[PDB]
Design a protein around this nucleic acid. Sequence first.
RNA 1: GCAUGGACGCGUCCAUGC
RNA 2: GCAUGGACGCGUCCAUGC
Lengths: 70, 71
Amino acid sequence: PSKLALIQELPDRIQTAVEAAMGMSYQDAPNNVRRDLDNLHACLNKAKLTVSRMVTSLLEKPSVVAYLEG
Amino acid sequence: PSKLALIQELPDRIQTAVEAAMGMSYQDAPNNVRRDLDNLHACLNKAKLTVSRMVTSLLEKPSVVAYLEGK
RNA sequence: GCAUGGACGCGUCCAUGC
RNA sequence: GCAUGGACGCGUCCAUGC
């Protein structure tokens, strides 16, 4: 795969690494563990959004884009 | 794949999604582009570290592990 | 109270782009 | 000015251990 692709695929690959964990349910979990698992969801969500934002920043830099392809 | 395994695999599933981009070399690129891609690396290493620290912090809590296991 | 992890708010500084 | 990322400081909330 080309470098431009390597970066464009980041947000999705990360989507994949994480979808299983934050796709599981903890309806029976106690209030204190429910809060901790919710904190995990927030942590993953923020890592997901950050990478996503980072890549959008990278692909809006005409310089970075030019290099990634020629 | 139980709930416990589901969470234990995180740091690894994350390394996977990220190693391709991170193995990529850009040492032939211009200085400003080299800087942004270093910032990319800095950024991704922090995401991996945050998640790992989160998972470890979680798996050290007897209350949460008990739940994930099934007790 | 001490420490750890995360989220969030305020500010300082560094880099990059427009 | 705007945007993104990183470092640092201060503060708030949650959780855990002692």
